[PDB]
Structures are given as structure tokens and as C-alpha cells.
């Protein structure tokens, strides 16, 4: 009979993530970690330390890739009328999708766990001003990291900047990217070939017959610098406007000035490129 089953998740140290899992493709059979303000180590099968290969996990529908070292739980050999303890250490590696929301000071993993660090926290170009809720020694930004695929065993040639965070329960690793060209507070919604702009009553009316929509804006423009994290609006607007002009009005119209930006009731940002016919 089971008198108790203590199940815990321990983080994999940095020196084991880089030197063991990423370099050799194996994982240690002993878990040494800090729990309840004490250094605890568990030996798999109550045996000596050994490197175990990380084999692919059993396939499940609509699940990400995963690797593990052990597949059976170790239980003590039978000895009559005694309480016996058995230790099992299963080194698990899971690719997950992580999501963050504005102001991007923290992110969650697909397993429902929270990481209280900004996804853009790092050491370069103002990444050290991002939010972090952990000690400085729980985070490590490795540069010149060569990721090793655990199935194909093919090292990536291009080095990447890899953040590694050792939370009390696990160790997350993710590729560092700059915040400004990655996130945006606005997303492109519609691309309209023909919005007629009409000036009346001290207001602009942008009417599109294709989608049957009329937007009302103030006469003055909307300053793009006023948009928080608004580095995508300009790029998307220029790209879409150029594409549509090349598609339809390349042989008939010409652009008149740089694209303007207006704010329309309901909170819609209109990037408008006025056009004038060859006449």
C-alpha cells in the first residue's frame, strides 16, 4: 500500500540546461535544487548519478513536442512489514507557447504557469529597464547560443540570444527579441482601395463603398508619436498603401504627399494616402 507520494517539480540548473541538455543532449539523473529554504537532492532509482538520454515523449493530438528521460516510476523492492521509500527523477523538456499582454511585464506558459518577468528583459539596448520580479542570479542571458534540436540532433548554425530564468518550479528559456519592433498596441483591420475623403462641417468623412463604412474624424491629424508602442502602424500603412497603389492605381493616379493619419470616432486609426489623377 502507498503511505504517501510526494510529487515535486524541480528546476533544471543553467549549468545543466547548457552543458548537459543542449551540448550532449542528455540530462542528469539527480535533481539538486532549493525547496522550502533548503538544498535538497534526489537520486533517481536511489542510484548513482548518471546521464540519461532525452527520448521523445509519446505523441498526443494537438500537443507540442516533449522529451523525457524516464518512463516508469521507481518503487521500493518488497521487504515484509516495513515502510520503504523510493525516489524517481524524470527530466522533462517541453516546448510551450508563451503569451503576454500589455504592458508586457510578465508572461504565461501553455501549462498555466506564470513567469513574472518581461519577455523583453535582458542585458542590451535598454532591456534591463524591463520588469523583473526575481533575483539577479535567477536570470541569465546567454549570447552566441547554438540551439540543439532534441529529435533531429541538428545544431543551429545561427547564434541566438537566449534568456534563461530559473523559477522555483521550472526553468524557462526563450529567444530574446527587441520590444519595439515586436509588439504593437494597434493591429491592421481593413485595407480599402477607395475611401473618398470629404471635408464638411469642420470634419473629415472617409467613406468606403466596398465595406460600406463612413468614418468621422477631426480636421487636424493624429500624431503617430502619441501612440504607445506604435511602431507597426507606420510600417504596415506604408507597405499596404504601396501594394494597393501598385495593384490598382499605378497607371492612372499619383500619390499626393506622404500618408496622413487620422483618428475616427469609435477609436479607428486611418492611414490615408490621397491620390490625384493624371489629369
Amino acid at each position: 500500500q502507498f503511505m504517501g507520494i510526494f510529487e515535486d517539480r524541480a528546476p533544471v540548473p543553467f549549468e545543466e540546461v547548457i552543458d548537459k541538455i543542449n551540448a550532449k543532449g542528455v540530462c542528469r539523473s539527480t535533481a539538486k535544487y532549493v525547496r522550502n529554504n533548503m538544498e535538497t537532492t534526489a537520486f533517481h532509482r536511489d542510484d548513482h548519478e548518471t546521464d540519461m538520454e532525452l527520448k521523445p515523449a509519446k505523441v498526443a493530438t494537438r500537443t507540442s513536442r516533449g522529451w523525457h528521460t524516464t518512463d516508469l516510476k521507481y518503487n521500493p523492492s518488497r521487504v515484509e512489514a516495513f515502510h520503504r521509500y523510493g525516489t524517481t527523477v524524470n527530466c522533462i523538456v517541453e516546448e510551450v507557447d508563451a503569451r503576454s499582454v500589455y504592458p508586457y511585464d510578465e508572461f504565461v506558459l501553455a501549462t498555466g504557469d506564470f513567469v513574472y518577468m518581461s519577455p523583453f528583459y535582458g542585458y542590451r539596448e535598454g532591456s534591463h529597464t524591463e520588469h523583473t520580479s526575481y533575483a539577479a542570479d535567477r536570470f541569465k542571458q546567454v549570447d552566441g547560443f547554438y540551439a540543439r534540436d532534441l529529435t533531429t540532433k541538428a545544431r543551429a548554425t545561427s547564434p541566438t540570444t537566449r534568456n534563461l530564468l530559473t523559477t522555483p518550479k521550472f526553468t524557462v528559456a526563450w529567444d530574446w527579441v527587441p520590444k519595439r519592433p515586436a509588439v504593437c498596441t494597434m493591429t491592421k483591420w481593413q485595407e480599402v482601395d477607395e475611401m473618398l475623403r470629404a471635408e464638411y462641417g469642420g470634419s473629415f468623412r472617409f467613406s468606403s463603398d466596398a465595406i460600406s463604412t463612413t468614418f468621422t474624424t477631426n480636421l487636424t491629424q493624429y500624431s503617430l508619436s502619441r501612440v504607445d508602442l506604435g511602431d507597426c502602424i507606420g510600417r504596415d500603412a506604408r507597405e499596404a498603401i504601396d501594394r494597393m497603389f501598385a495593384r490598382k492605381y499605378n497607371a492612372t493616379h499619383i500619390k499626393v504627399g506622404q500618408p496622413q493619419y487620422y483618428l475616427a470616432t469609435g477609436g479607428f486609426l486611418i492611414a490615408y494616402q490621397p491620390l490625384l489623377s493624371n489629369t
Epitope: 551540448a23 546521464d51 547564434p159
Partner: antibody
Framework: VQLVQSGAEVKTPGASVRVSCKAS????????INWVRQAAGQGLEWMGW????????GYARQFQGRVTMTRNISANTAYMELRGLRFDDTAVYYC???????????????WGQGTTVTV | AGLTQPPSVSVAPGKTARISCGGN??????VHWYQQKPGQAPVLVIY???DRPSGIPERFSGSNSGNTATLTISRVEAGDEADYYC?????????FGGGTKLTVL
């Protein structure tokens, strides 16, 4: 990232040499700096490693007590300083991004041009 | 805490060159193979015992098992004449191999 070292140095026995290695392109706190020297016509001889993020260093057993490894984060530079020079210290010194704090199994993928030191 | 390498290896241009690196339980370490032409900094040609950096031709290959690591250069060109070093991390230091001077006949 690119590593650029100082010029050649000509010294006398018993003097001290500070070799500078400046990193360009990265914050330089995200990797380690390994100093390794090669004599005239001999093989590579590792000298030490330094973690510019924290300042932690690790030297070879044969270079303990004669090598001081320091850094200037503001100027993005790492310095290796040898004391008590002798005749066999005439060598080409290279700074590289290699093993250390970021991981003991790392590779010396990027190198400096190397400085020639003659006593 | 030392790696044993042959001082010199001579191979005809048409054939393949094998460079060995011996050590106690080197199969548990990542052997990185560096190539050095005269008057140049070493250039990494193999890392993590089996992998080639960007821009490195398919000719180079590596293996590491038991007490021996091996670098194999297939179709040895005349420009492959260089000094090759095997590097692992032992205790708290990286030990460098003695160096093998590959001679192309």
C-alpha cells in the same frame, strides 16, 4: 559581435602587461571572455576566463597569482594583466567568447586578432 | 587533465585525413575542433563533437566516444594544411590538445 585588441607590446623581464579587448555589436555582458596565448611556433595555451556580467574569473593553475582579469562595462572592454613577466611570455594573446559562467561546454566561436608581446 | 594528439598527420590530396584526440572519459565532454593557419587566429571548424559552424564545408566531420575523439577531413584540399586543436573543459579549465599539423602531399 567583434573583438578588437590593442597593439603589440615590447617590455622587459619582470614588468607587467595589460592587454585590452573591446567588444562591438553586443552589450558584452551576455557572454564570457577567454584569454588564451600561443607562443612562437607552439600550440594554444589557455590562460583564463572572465564573466564581464559579474566579474567572476577563473585562471589556469599555471597562471594563478600572475594574471589579473578585469573589465570596464561603460567602455565595453575587458583587460588581462600579466605580472612578473619572463622570457617565455613572448606570445600572441587572443581574447575570445568561450566557456565560463555562460556554460563550461561553450565554444570559442569568435576571436580577437591577437596582440604580440615580446620581453 | 590533458588531451593527447598526434604531432603530425600526412595525407594525400585525394584521400581523407583522420586526426585523433585522446583523453580519460573524453566521451562525456564536448570536443571542439579549431583550425589555425599560420599567422591567423584559430577558426572553429567543429563544435559539440558533431556539428559544423556556418560556412564550414561538408567535408569536415567529427565523432567523440569512449576515450577518443576524431576529426575526419574528406577530400583533403591543398588549403586544409593547418594546425588542428581539440578543446574540452576539464575541472574548471579548458584543456587544449597538443596540436596536429596536417600536411597535404
Amino acid at each position: 559581435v567583434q573583438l578588437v585588441q590593442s597593439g603589440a607590446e615590447v617590455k622587459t623581464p619582470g614588468a607587467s602587461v595589460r592587454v585590452s579587448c573591446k567588444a562591438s555589436g553586443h552589450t558584452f555582458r551576455t557572454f564570457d571572455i577567454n584569454w588564451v596565448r600561443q607562443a612562437a611556433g607552439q600550440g594554444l595555451e589557455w590562460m583564463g576566463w572572465m564573466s564581464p556580467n559579474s566579474g567572476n574569473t577563473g585562471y589556469a593553475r599555471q597562471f594563478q597569482g600572475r594574471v589579473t582579469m578585469t573589465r570596464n562595462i561603460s567602455a565595453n572592454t575587458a583587460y588581462m594583466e600579466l605580472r612578473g613577466l619572463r622570457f617565455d611570455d613572448t606570445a600572441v594573446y587572443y581574447c575570445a567568447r568561450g566557456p565560463g559562467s555562460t556554460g563550461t561546454t561553450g565554444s570559442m566561436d569568435v576571436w580577437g586578432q591577437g596582440t604580440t608581446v615580446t620581453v | 587533465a590533458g588531451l593527447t594528439q598526434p604531432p603530425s598527420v600526412s595525407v594525400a590530396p585525394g584521400k581523407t585525413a583522420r586526426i585523433s584526440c585522446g583523453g580519460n572519459n573524453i566521451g562525456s565532454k564536448s570536443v571542439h575542433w579549431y583550425q589555425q593557419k599560420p599567422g591567423q587566429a584559430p577558426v572553429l571548424v567543429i563544435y559539440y563533437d558533431s556539428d559544423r559552424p556556418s560556412g564550414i564545408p561538408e567535408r569536415f566531420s567529427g565523432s567523440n566516444s569512449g576515450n577518443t575523439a576524431t576529426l575526419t577531413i574528406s577530400r583533403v584540399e591543398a588549403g586544409d594544411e593547418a594546425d588542428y586543436y581539440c578543446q574540452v573543459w576539464d575541472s574548471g579549465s579548458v584543456v587544449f590538445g597538443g596540436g596536429t599539423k596536417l600536411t597535404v602531399l
